[PDB]
Design a binder for this molecule. Structure first.
Ligand SMILES: CCCOc1nc2c(C)c(C(=O)C3=C(O)CCCC3=O)ccc2n(C)c1=O
Ligand SMILES: CCCOc1nc2c(C)c(C(=O)C3=C(O)CCCC3=O)ccc2n(C)c1=O
Ligand SMILES: [Co+2]
Ligand SMILES: [Co+2]
Lengths: 376, 376
């Protein structure tokens, strides 16, 4: 059931912003590893004396990488006179975030009908304010509230990327594309699920859609999906959620799930590049798992299509309404914290409805069971 | 003339260590951009709870990328019980370096006959101690003295990479190679050249080999070359050296010159990758400059060879004894601070003697003059 209880009008995921120590090297790594094009910049060359911000795009997916310059470059500035293109940016908050957590997501940004009203309604409904609504060039409004840990939910609304950003010139934007098209969901880890759910669901009106307890929060059309995990203690293998919290110094964003229009092509392109600057993938399931695939999704995937999943290490799950293919990268940076999921959903055609096929929770049982059989 | 006045026995450049915020993303970018293989690691997987260090190699060139983990992971440790593989590492110094300067070189490491004696003699001769000699696994000795700004000169000596580092497994080490073979020289920028020269020459015994004043310090066989620049003020175009100091928050390493066994192949491979994760190059000189090449180095480079320089944007200079080909990357990171030079030297065969052909100071005049002609 879906009560459609959003307290303000939400459209779609807009962008994800990483807070980095050096935005250049992270953006170039990600661009090559994921096949995203350099689309926009705000930095010294565009008159920004405060922060370096570089935007990568693939389809509707927008990754923003931001790092601070020396505060000395903007010491004369005040907020009314700032050359920063993102008014919420603060040297101290950025350095403190990155020092405490390492490389990771600062902002999950959603496009809303009216960022000012979204901020007002959120805070009136218990959201902790982070950056008040600011109108950029009489064209765009941006506001931020706290989401979990040091991650903010960022609202952007447009009258008609951001003012102050420049479109990068052609020689600098090579048209990489491995098939990734949009952000499917963004998942946080917290020490206690209950209070985090009540806080976020409380100010948004989003409704509810081993080693972990989890629940998914969703907007009215369920195209904005924000799962949250908590650890399950006392268990045999130490909870991966608890390991995240220890190495991240507390709550934060665990994984971004990126939808591909062709997960076979995406994974072929990404795996070709894993050892030459790209991203590594988690270990593949045993051949047991892909033998059992015929019995699970035989009417969905060809024998050749299922063999392709096994070559690429793709996981497949299925619920009442649809089928999802999925795979997970190793952590994106030094710490075992944030990672990426590549996903493609089959079914639920009306457009495809958000969340079609679930989030892969059935693959816990299939993996354990397939692992048991391989040992034989 | 060469007085051969080294106060201790120096062999060769050993490695360059970058202090990063995230060593993973910088190392992967550099590996792809420069064609260096992943050779060794010290991190959580090898029992290092303190820092992540990843070593890239190309020929004899060794690039080390290091970042701190959360101090919380090693809070119980003391220096006698540390799991760090580099005993000079300190969470606070690393965070402070990176926060103040951004991505850059912390250590220029040279291999010496006896790091303990090198440290003792250096400090006895005015060097500012940074990390005392420490013997690793009864096999390697490491010590550090201050060089300029927050950059240290690191001494390593071997009895027979470092203890505590693991050789990376084969699936993780793709054998990239674009022809780079060793570090030719490493250059610092300081506000005042005189006192920096007197300090470094004072404790090493190294001898002396627009917009800047510069001088090169050299070991006995002149295979360790450490130039130092200072700005020239009052001039028309603002000094690039002064711009470095402003954006770097003071003195530090300006550029690493990497010798290639085939600069044509290196530059073809690097330029192919500039816009897909690699490094960008400075703007090429006008076709004027390459027309004048025939009159300058005609007896050295074929017409086809000189046309190849023009396709790749290679600079060529020549002194009494040899010829050098050279080109400069744009800055390696967000700030206009550190960059890389690719170099190949022709001549001075006895082996090739260090510094053959100079450092390209003649190309200032040729560029200005060639620029004047292009405007015509
Ligand atoms: C071992 C089972 C399959 O392998 C894995 N699957 C994972 C999945 C399926 C997710 C995930 O995407 C997800 C949930 O699990 C529910 C909340 C919404 C959501 O996005 C996250 C991490 C996973 N890890 C680490 C695995 O090792
Ligand atoms: C404009 C003239 C050629 O273009 C350039 N040449 C450069 C050279 C030749 C060097 C350099 O390598 C060097 C010296 O100049 C003397 C001290 C030892 C040394 O290593 C450094 C920077 C340069 N930049 C920025 C240029 O734009
Ligand atoms: Co997921
Ligand atoms: Co040079």
């Amino acid at each position: 059931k879906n009560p459609k209880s959003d307290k303000f009008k939400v459209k779609r995921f807009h962008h994800i912003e990483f807070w980095c120590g050096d935005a250049t090297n992270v953006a170039r790594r990600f661009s090559w590893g994921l096949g995203m094009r350099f689309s926009a910049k705000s930095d010294l060359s565009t008159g920004n004396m405060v922060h370096a911000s570089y935007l990568l795009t693939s389809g509707d997916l927008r990754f923003l990488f931001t790092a601070p310059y020396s505060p000395s470059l903007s010491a004369g500035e005040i907020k009314p006179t700032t050359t920063a293109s993102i008014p919420s940016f603060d040297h101290g908050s950025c350095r403190s975030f990155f020092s405490s957590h390492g490389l990771g997501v600062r902002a999950v940004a959603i496009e809303v009908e009216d960022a000012e009203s979204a901020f007002s309604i959120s805070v009136a409904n218990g959201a902790i304010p982070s950056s008040p609504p600011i109108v950029l060039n009489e064209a765009v409004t941006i506001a931020e509230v706290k989401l979990y840990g040091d991650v903010v939910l960022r609202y952007v609304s447009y009258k008609a990327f951001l003012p102050g950003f420049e479109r990068v010139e052609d020689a600098s934007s090579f048209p990489l594309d491995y098939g990734i098209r949009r952000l499917d969901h963004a998942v946080g880890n917290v020490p206690e699920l209950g209070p985090a759910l009540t806080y976020v669901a409380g100010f948004t009106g989003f409704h509810q859609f081993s080693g972990l307890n989890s629940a998914v929060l969703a907007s009215n059309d369920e195209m904005v999906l924000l799962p949250i995990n908590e650890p399950v203690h006392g268990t045999k293998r130490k909870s991966q959620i608890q390991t995240y919290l220890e190495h991240n110094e507390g709550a934060g964003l665990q994984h971004l799930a990126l939808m591909s229009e062709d997960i076979f092509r995406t994974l072929r392109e990404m795996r070709k590049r894993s050892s030459i600057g790209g991203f590594d993938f988690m270990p593949s399931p045993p051949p047991t798992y892909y033998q059992n695939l015929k019995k699970r999704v035989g009417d969905v995937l060809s024998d050749d299509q299922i063999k392709e999943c096994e070559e690429l290490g793709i996981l497949v799950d299925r619920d009442d309404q649809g089928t999802l293919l999925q795979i997970f990268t190793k952590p994106l940076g030094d710490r075992p914290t944030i990672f990426i999921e590549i996903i493609q959903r089959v079914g639920c055609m009306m457009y495809q409805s958000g969340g079609c096929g679930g989030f892969g929770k059935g693959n816990f049982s299939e993996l354990f069971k397939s692992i048991e059989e391989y040992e034989k």
